[PDB]
Structure formats: structure tokens, C-alpha cells
Amino acid sequence: WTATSGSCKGRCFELQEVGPPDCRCDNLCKSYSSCCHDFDELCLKTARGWECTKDRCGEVRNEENACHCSEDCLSRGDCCTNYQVVCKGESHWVDDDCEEIKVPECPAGFVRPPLIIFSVDGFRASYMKKGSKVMPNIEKLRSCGTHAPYMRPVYPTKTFPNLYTLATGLYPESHGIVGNSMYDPVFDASFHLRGREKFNHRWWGGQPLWITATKQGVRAGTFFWSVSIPHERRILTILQWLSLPDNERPSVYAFYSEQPDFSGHKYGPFGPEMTNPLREIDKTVGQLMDGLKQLRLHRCVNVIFVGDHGMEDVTCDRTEFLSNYLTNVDDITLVPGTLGRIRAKSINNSKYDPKTIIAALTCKKPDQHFKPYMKQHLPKRLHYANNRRIEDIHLLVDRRWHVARKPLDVYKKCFFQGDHGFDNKVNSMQTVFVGYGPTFKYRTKVPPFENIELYNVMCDLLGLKPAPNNGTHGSLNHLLRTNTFRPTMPDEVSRPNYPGIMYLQSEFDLGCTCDDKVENKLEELNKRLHTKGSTKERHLLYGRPAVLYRTSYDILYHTDFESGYSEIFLMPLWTSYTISKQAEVSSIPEHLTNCVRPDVRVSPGFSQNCLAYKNDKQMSYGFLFPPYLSSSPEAKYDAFLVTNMVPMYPAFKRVWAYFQRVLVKKYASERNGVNVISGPIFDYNYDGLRDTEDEIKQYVEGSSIPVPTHYYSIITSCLDFTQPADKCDGPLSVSSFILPHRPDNDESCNSSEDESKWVEELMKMHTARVRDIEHLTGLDFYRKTSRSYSEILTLKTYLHTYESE
Ligand SMILES: *[C@@H]1O[C@H](CO)[C@@H](O[C@@H]2O[C@H](CO)[C@@H](O[C@@H]3O[C@H](CO[C@H]4O[C@H](CO)[C@@H](O)[C@H](O[C@H]5O[C@H](CO)[C@@H](O)[C@H](O)[C@@H]5O[C@H]5O[C@H](CO)[C@@H](O)[C@H](O)[C@@H]5O)[C@@H]4O)[C@@H](O)[C@H](O[C@H]4O[C@H](CO)[C@@H](O)[C@H](O)[C@@H]4O[C@H]4O[C@H](CO)[C@@H](O)[C@H](O)[C@@H]4O)[C@@H]3O)[C@H](O)[C@H]2NC(C)=O)[C@H](O)[C@H]1NC(C)=O
Ligand SMILES: Cc1cc(OCc2ccc(=O)[nH]n2)c(C(C)C)cc1Cl
Numbered sequence: 001w002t003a004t005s006g007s008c009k010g011r012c013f014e015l016q017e018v019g020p021p022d023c024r025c026d027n028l029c030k031s032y033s034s035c036c037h038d039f040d041e042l043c044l045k046t047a048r049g050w051e052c053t054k055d056r057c058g059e060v061r062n063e064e065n066a067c068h069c070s071e072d073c074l075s076r077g078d079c080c081t082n083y084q085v086v087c088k089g090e091s092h093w094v095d096d097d098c099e100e101i102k103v104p105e106c107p108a109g110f111v112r113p114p115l116i117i118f119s120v121d122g123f124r125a126s127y128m129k130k131g132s133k134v135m136p137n138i139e140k141l142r143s144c145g146t147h148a149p150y151m152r153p154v155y156p157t158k159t160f161p162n163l164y165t166l167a168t169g170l171y172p173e174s175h176g177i178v179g180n181s182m183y184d185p186v187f188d189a190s191f192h193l194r195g196r197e198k199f200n201h202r203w204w205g206g207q208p209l210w211i212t213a214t215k216q217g218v219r220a221g222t223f224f225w226s227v228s229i230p231h232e233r234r235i236l237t238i239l240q241w242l243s244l245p246d247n248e249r250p251s252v253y254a255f256y257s258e259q260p261d262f263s264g265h266k267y268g269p270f271g272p273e274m275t276n277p278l279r280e281i282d283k284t285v286g287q288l289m290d291g292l293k294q295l296r297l298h299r300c301v302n303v304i305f306v307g308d309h310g311m312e313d314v315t316c317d318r319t320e321f322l323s324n325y326l327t328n329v330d331d332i333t334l335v336p337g338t339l340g341r342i343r344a345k346s347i348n349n350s351k352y353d354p355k356t357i358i359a360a361l362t363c364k365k366p367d368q369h370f371k372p373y374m375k376q377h378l379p380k381r382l383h384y385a386n387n388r389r390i391e392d393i394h395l396l397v398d399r400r401w402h403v404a405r406k407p408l409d410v411y412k413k414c415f416f417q418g419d420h421g422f423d424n425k426v427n428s429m430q431t432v433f434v435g436y437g438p439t440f441k442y443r444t445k446v447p448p449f450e451n452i453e454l455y456n457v458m459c460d461l462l463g464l465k466p467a468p469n470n471g472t473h474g475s476l477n478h479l480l481r482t483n484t485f486r487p488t489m490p491d492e493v494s495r496p497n498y499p500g501i502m503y504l505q506s507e508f509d510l511g512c513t514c515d516d517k518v519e520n521k522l523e524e525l526n527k528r529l530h531t532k533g534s535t536k537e538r539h540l541l542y543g544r545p546a547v548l549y550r551t552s553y554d555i556l557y558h559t560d561f562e563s564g565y566s567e568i569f570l571m572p573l574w575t576s577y578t579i580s581k582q583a584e585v586s587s588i589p590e591h592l593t594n595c596v597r598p599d600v601r602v603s604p605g606f607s608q609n610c611l612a613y614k615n616d617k618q619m620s621y622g623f624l625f626p627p628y629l630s631s632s633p634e635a636k637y638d639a640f641l642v643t644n645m646v647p648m649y650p651a652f653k654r655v656w657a658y659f660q661r662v663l664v665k666k667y668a669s670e671r672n673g674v675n676v677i678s679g680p681i682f683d684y685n686y687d688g689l690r691d692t693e694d695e696i697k698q699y700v701e702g703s704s705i706p707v708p709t710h711y712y713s714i715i716t717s718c719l720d721f722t723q724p725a726d727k728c729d730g731p732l733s734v735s736s737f738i739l740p741h742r743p744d745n746d747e748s749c750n751s752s753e754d755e756s757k758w759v760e761e762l763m764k765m766h767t768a769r770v771r772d773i774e775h776l777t778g779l780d781f782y783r784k785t786s787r788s789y790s791e792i793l794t795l796k797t798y799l800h801t802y803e804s805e
């Protein structure tokens with residue numbers, strides 16, 4: 001119950017929310033149905049519109065007007081935004097030349113440059129170039145400030161998951177807003193775009209920027225604007241707040257526009273109807289900048305222009321229906337559209353079986369426009385599994401398509417021409433970032449980056465300590481003129497052992513065999529050198545990875561590769577090798593097909609054994625350093641060491657063998673050499689973080705050999721490909737992947753074909769940042785380079801997306 005009988009007199013858009021049942025005059029009062037009786041009258045004036053005209057100049061103040069053109073409006077903080085232009089002969093901000101803001105130029109009493117986040121819904125990255133002719137204010141911010149060609153949103157590429165990621169620095173699986181629609185089974189409660197439940201605080205996890213600021217003594221304006229408040233009034237409210245006394249004035253503000261998303265859904269991303277919404281958003285930017293210029297704040301405030309996601313062409317006819325696949329369609333609940341999430345309709349139905357639903361959805365139609373996954377098998381770069389609100393069964397929908405349960409859902413539940421929600425590497429889902437102000441760089445273009453990184457930067461801009469988040473703090477230092485965050489590298493927790501030769505061959509009883517007893521001071525001294533690390537500088541180019549947790553491991557050196565061998569997991573944590581452009585590929589000799597060799601530096605008790613693989617009828621093995629890329633027949637024997645072996649399902653060995661035999665050489669040819677680090681990953685609780693030994697759910701039958709959930713490779717070369725990977729004087733170039741270690745290739749519908757037709761496609765889908773691999777392994781890479789630490793942090797956040805230009 002709201003006692004709407006109180007008054008908003010002098011309380012309009014008050015910053016502190018008054019507690020029930022007193023009536024409210026803050027911005028959220030509309031949403032709660034709780035505004036005081038006179039909120040519209042006092043707080044939402046529209047009389048005479050939003051612009052001064054010549055005849056209004058120096059008018060007598062009339063408090064009825066939406067905004068003012070009287071001589072007292074500046075000191076009142078409530079002129080129409082074009083007041084100085086119409087009445088005082090001033091220029092619009094957009095008509096003024098760009099001039100570098102070398103230092104903040106702030107009115108007295110300003111303790112720090114304020115930050116204004118101007119957020120636009122559905123603003124696709126390519127609008128910056130394609131609409132630049134009708135967005136002169138935005139184009140000036142872009143060209144004069146710091147801008148990326150695009151910014152990558154989080155998955156799913158929906159509004160609230162992305163806005164809340166902007167606010168928190170967290171993946172949606174961590175902040176809890178995992179869709180615009182959700183069921184939480186612990187709460188037994190449903191979140192929807194419409195209604196009141198969505199405001200309940202239990203949905204919203206982590207710590208958004210306005211709470212971070214407030215806890216640290218920095219005041220914040222409204223982030224969530226009620227839809228019915230017009231944009232001109234939002235701008236006027238921000239400008240009014242900026243005129244408050246020092247002790248009352250917020251330092252951080254947000255504006256939000258529902259456009260161009262609103263029209264994009266109706267007309268498609270490039271519908272001729274789209275030019276007008278773009279002009280209108282630009283005009284709003286112009287109002288804000290003119291207003292800042294009036295307040296003498298246009299060279300003091302940092303402004304961020306940022307979108308939540310893009311927009312793709314999608315129509316009703318491009319819908320796949322689950323009723324064309326499933327017999328049991330009425331026993332499931334589907335969350336539909338540009339992604340699908342499936343759960344049982346009733347928890348009392350014990351005939352419900354995820355495995356038969358996945359199977360009925362897998363490669364059933366030749367041009368099928370969605371792919372089903374158990375959530376733990378989705379690409380790890382989506383970071384979309386570790387939350388009870390994410391259903392176990394997920395459908396990844398191809399761009400331009402929808403999925404629905406039944407046809408009647410699409411006409412009785414074509415209207416639309418645009419939608420979004422798809423895989424966040426898809427080009428049409430990319431959105432915008434521009435930063436303009438004293439703290440941002442001048443006329444500077446930065447490479448694309450992910451929106452999870454912005455919270456840290458916003459905290460840097462405000463002098464706040466960020467709450468723990470998923471950005472990599474320092475990775476965006478190159479956007480900033482000042483206020484950079486200068487991190488130190490994490491400390492190594494576990495130092496390696498460097499074992500020498502300590503075991504005789506007969507101490508081992510591993511059930512392995514090798515045809516290797518085939519017999520020199522010329523060549524024996526040299527091989528001893530190789531086992532002590534004499535080639536290490538060729539194969540370990542950026543220092544050894546640091547192990548950031550407590551464990552027992554050995555560094556093992558070889559002619560062609562170096563490894564960090566875990567005595568706990570019985571296999572390498574990492575294996576590092578360099579392949580020059582000139583390297584040659586060779587086969588595994590006939591006599592060495594089943595060759596596995598005890599490693600005399602590592603005890604029998606800390607070694608794998610061949611018998612376990614013999615007896616595990618489902619599991620085979622592969623090697624981390626590939627025998628195919630051996631530098632010489634003699635060095636090839638090193639590749640068959642038991643310490644270079646890892647468990648691999650036959651189906652996965654198809655993928656891995658093609659990568660090692662074909663693709664590594666292809667990359668070395670194209671990139672002028674590559675350095676490769678490969679290894680296993682164990683993430684059985686799908687939290688994106690390295691499993692401890694007691695979280696392992698599967699072992700090679702009868703043994704203590706843990707089965708990886710994934711295998712990674714980090715492939716580094718010189719950004720200037722005129723220099724070979726091993727003699728690179730400057731910046732680096734990286735691509736990485738995290739391949740799921742699965743016992744079938746059901747994910748690849750074309751897997752009956754030659755690996756050349758499907759393997760690299762799979763690997764592209766499972767592209768990864770080096771940072772993703774760090775989280776999953778407890779390793780820290782690139783510890784010894786000639787590059788700045790912030791540059792290396794940006795490299796570790798790089799994702800190679802394989803999308804066209
Ligand atoms: C992205 O960045 C984020 C942020 O840094 C990373 O997330 C952190 O990861 C940590 C490890 O997973 C995690 O640490 C745990 O904290 C527990 C305390 O939990 C509360 O307090 C924090 C701090 O305020 C709060 O943020 C939490 O909020 C979560 O939960 C609520 C709802 O319950 C949500 O509103 C919110 O969105 C968030 O949910 C997310 O995280 C939780 C896990 O916390 C998931 O369950 C959700 O799916 C969702 O993703 C909490 O309110 C603490 O209890 C844990 O301690 C256990 O484990 C440690 C191991 O060190 C052990 O010492 C303890 O014994 C303890 O075990 C006991 O409980 C076990 C489980 O019941 C039991 O099995 C044992 O037998 C023991 O009795 C743990 O330390 C931290 O909370 C989150 N922070 C956030 C914000 O998510 C994330 O990892 C990064 N991602 C990547 C890929 O890098
Ligand atoms: C910049 C920004 C805006 C924002 O909400 C704006 C909004 C969205 C829908 C709406 O109806 N009204 N307003 C959020 C939300 C509160 C999570 C976070 C951030 Cl970071």
C-alpha cells in the first residue's frame with residue numbers, strides 16, 4: 001500500500017528513496033506504482049517543450065515550463081539545453097573544433113571529474129560508421145576521444161544480462177541475470193521483463209557500480225530510468241543534479257535509451273526506418289553536451305558512450321520448431337527465441353530424460369539452424385554454465401534464426417524484423433564503446449575488447465576500488481591518459497623440481513613397450529645438453545608459466561619441447577614447443593606405432609601406465625608434444641615418453657591428431673613460426689576454474705590417471721610476421737582454444753567426413769582467451785617478455801574470433 005497523499009514539492013527526482021508507505025518522488029516511483037499524487041504535475045513538466053526560442057529569451061520565470069530561458073536559469077540549473085545558443089550567441093558543442101583535454105578543467109568545488117555513462121540499447125557496432133552522416137555529436141565524441149571499432153557483449157546478447165555486466169564486471173553466470181526471462185528453482189520464482197518480481201534484490205548478485213561508489217563515499221545518480229520519462233527529462237534531471245552543492249552532488253551518472261533497439265526489432269538493423277532513431281539519439285547526445293558546456297563542464301566530465309548488444313535480421317519464417325523433432329513436446333518447458341533453454345515441465349515426471357531430448361535434437365535435419373548442448377559442453381568462452389538459473393539443456397541458435405516449441409507460439413502467443421541474443425562473437429551482436437574526456441586519450445583508436453573489462457575502468461575513473469570481478473584490471477590501461485592501474489604479476493606459489501636421471505628401466509612395470517634398444521662422444525654429450533635445457537630458449541619463449549597454487553611438479557627438458565610435469569595429476573600441466581616456418585612434418589615410424597617409454601627422471605609411482613589404457617575399453621591416449629613435429633629421428637623418441645602421454649577418447653584423437661599433424665604446420669607457415677603451449681584442463685563442476693584433485697569425476701579405469709574435461713593450446717607468434725616467432729623484437733600475436741574432451745563428435749554434424757572438412761570449424765567455435773586458460777589451470781603465462789605488463793594483460797584478454805572484417 002502507498003499513501004499517495006504526500007507531495008513531491010521540492011523533492012522531484014530525489015536521490016534517496018523514501019521507505020514505504022510514504023509516497024515516492026524518485027525515478028523508480030513509476031515502476032513501483034508509488035509516486036505522490038503530484039509527481040506528474042511537478043516533476044514531469046512538458047509545457048512549451050524542450051527548446052528555447054528567440055522570443056523566450058530573458059522571459060519572466062514561469063515555473064510551469066518544462067525548461068527555462070529566463071536570465072536566472074543558469075543559477076537555477078534548469079535552462080533548456082540550447083539556452084546559451086539561442087539567447088546568448090553561443091555555439092553548439094558539436095560545432096566547436098576538437099581541442100585536446102590535456103587536464104581536467106573543472107569549476108571550483110569539483111573534487112574529481114564526474115563520469116556520465118550514456119547507454120544505448122541495441123546499438124550495433126557498425127552504426128558508428130554506417131550512420132556517421134546523421135550522428136554528428138556521436139561522431140565528434142568518437143573521432144576526438146578514444147574509441148574501439150567494436151565492443152564484445154556477453155552471452156546471451158540480451159539487454160539486462162549486458163547492462164548488469166556493464167554495472168558489475170561479472171559474467172551473467174556470476175551476477176545472476178542469465179536471461180531477460182528466468183526461473184530460479186531454489187526460490188521457486190520467475191523473473192520477467194514485465195512486472196514487479198524483476199526488482200526483487202535476490203535476482204541481482206555481485207556489486208554494481210552505484211553500490212561500489214556509495215560504499216566508498218562517492219554519490220551516484222539513477223541508472224534505471226522508467227520508460228515513460230522522456231529522454232529530454234532524463235537529460236534535464238542529470239544536468240540539474242550536476243548543479244547541486246558539492247556535498248550533495250553525485251559523481252557518477254547514467255542515461256539510458258531504449259532506441260535504437262525498439263525500432264530495430266520492428267524494422268531490422270538497417271531498415272530505412274532506422275535513420276530517424278539514430279538522428280534522435282544523436283540530438284539527445286547534443287543536448288547533454290550543450291548542457292555540460294553551459295555548466296562549464298564539457299572539458300571536466302568523462303563521458304562513456306556504450307551499447308549493450310547489436311541487432312541481427314530475424315523474421316518469423318526463420319523459426320525452427322521443437323515439435324518437428326520431439327515426440328514428447330508437451331513434457332518440456334522451453335525458453336525460446338535467439339537461444340533456447342529446456343527443462344522438464346513437471347519435476348514429478350520420472351519419464352523425463354535429458355539424454356533422449358539431446359539425441360532427438362542432434363543433427364536431425366540437413367540444414368538444422370540450432371545446435372543442442374548440455375550447458376557444461378558449451379564453448380568455455382561463453383562462461384555460461386555455473387548458475388542454477390541456467391537450464392542443463394541449451395540450444396545455440398544460428399544467427400538470423402529463432403527456435404520455438406510449436407508453430408502456434410509464433411502467431412498465437414510477421415511482426416518483427418530484427419532480434420539479438422546470439423553467440424557473443426557474432427558480428428551483428430557487437431556493440432559500441434567511445435570514451436571522451438580528460439581521463440581518456442585524445443583521437444585514439446583501441447582494439448576491440450569485452451564489456452566485462454569496463455567496470456574496472458569506471459572504478460579507475462572515479463577513484464574506486466573495484467569489487468572482485470571478471471575483468472583483468474590493467475588490460476584497458478591503453479584507453480586512459482591518467483588513472484592507469486599498475487598491477488604487479490602474481491607471485492609463483494609452487495617452485496618446480498628439476499629431476500635428473502634417477503631410475504633404472506627395470507624399476508618400471510608400466511606394461512609399456514617400445515622398439516627403442518637400437519644403438520659416441522659426438523652425439524652423447526649433445527643429448528645430455530638437451531636434457532639439461534640447452535634448447536630451452538628456443539622452445540620456452542616467454543618464460544616458464546608460473547603455478548599459482550600449491551602442488552608438486554617437475555620441469556622436464558627435451559630437444560624439441562619443455563614441460564611442467566604434475567606428480568599429482570600424472571601428466572603435464574603445460575608443454576611448450578616452437579615450430580619454425582621451415583619445420584617439417586614426419587610420420588610416426590611403423591616400429592614406433594605403440595611405443596611408450598618410461599621416463600628415467602620420474603618415479604614409477606608418479607608415472608602413468610600402459611596397462612590401464614589396455615584395460616579401459618573406452619579410453620586411448622595421445623601426446624602433448626606431437627611426434628609428427630620431431631626435429632630428427634633420434635629426437636622423436638622423446639615424444640613417446642610416458643611423461644608426454646595424456647588420456648584421449650578415440651573420437652577426440654581424430655581432432656587432436658589433425659591439429660598436431662596438419663594445423664600446427666599450417667599456422668607456422670602462415671605466421672612465420674609459432675610457439676605452442678598445450679595441456680589438459682579439468683573442470684568437472686563447470687565453474688571456469690581449475691579443479692582440485694578431489695573434484696575429478698572420471699579416471700582411466702582402474703587407475704589414478706584423471707581424465708581431462710578439455711585440452712587447450714596457446715599459439716603465439718610475432719605481430720610483425722616479417723620476424724620469426726623465436727626472434728621477435730616487438731608485440732606478440734596469439735590465438736588459443738579450449739577443446740572439449742568428448743567421447744563422440746556428435747557436436748560436429750559433418751564428422752563422418754575427412755577431418756579437413758570439420759576439425760578446424762570445431763576449433764574455431766572453441767576459441768579462447770589466454771585468460772580463460774589461466775582461470776582453468778591456475779597457470780600464469782608470458783612472465784618473461786620484453787613487453788609492458790599492461791600490454792601483456794591486453795594480449796591475455798585477446799579472443800581470435802574468426803569472424804569476417
Ligand atoms: C568471475 O568473478 C567472480 C567474482 O570474483 C568469481 O566468483 C567468485 O568465485 C568464488 C569461487 O567460486 C566464490 O567464493 C565462494 O564464496 C562463498 C560466499 O558466498 C557469498 O558471498 C559472496 C561475497 O559477498 C557473494 O558474492 C556470493 O554471491 C553468490 O551467490 C548469490 C546467491 O546465493 C548470488 O546472488 C550471486 O549472484 C553469487 O552467485 C554466484 O556464485 C555462487 C558461489 O558463491 C554460485 O553458487 C552461483 O551459481 C553464482 O555463479 C555469496 O552470497 C563461500 O561460501 C565459498 O566457500 C566454500 O568453498 C571454499 C573454497 O575455498 C571453502 O573454503 C569453504 O569451506 C566453502 O565450502 C563450504 O560450502 C560448500 C558449498 O556449500 C560445501 O560444499 C563445503 O563442504 C563447505 O561447507 C566460496 O569461497 C565467490 O562467492 C564468487 N563471487 C561471486 C560474486 O560470484 C568467478 O569465479 C569469476 N569467474 C571466472 C571464470 O574467473
Ligand atoms: C548504464 C546502465 C543502465 C542500466 O539500466 C538502464 C535501464 C534499463 C532498462 C530500463 O527500462 N530503464 N533503464 C543498468 C541496469 C539498471 C542494470 C545498468 C547500467 Cl550500467
Ligand SMILES: [Ca+2]
Nearest residue numbers: 683689690691
Ligand atoms: Ca572447476
Ligand code: NA
Nearest residue numbers: 613616619620
Ligand atoms: Na583403451
Ligand code: NA
Nearest residue numbers: 745746748751
Ligand atoms: Na558427428
Ligand SMILES: [Zn+2]
Nearest residue numbers: 122261265420
Ligand atoms: Zn531488443
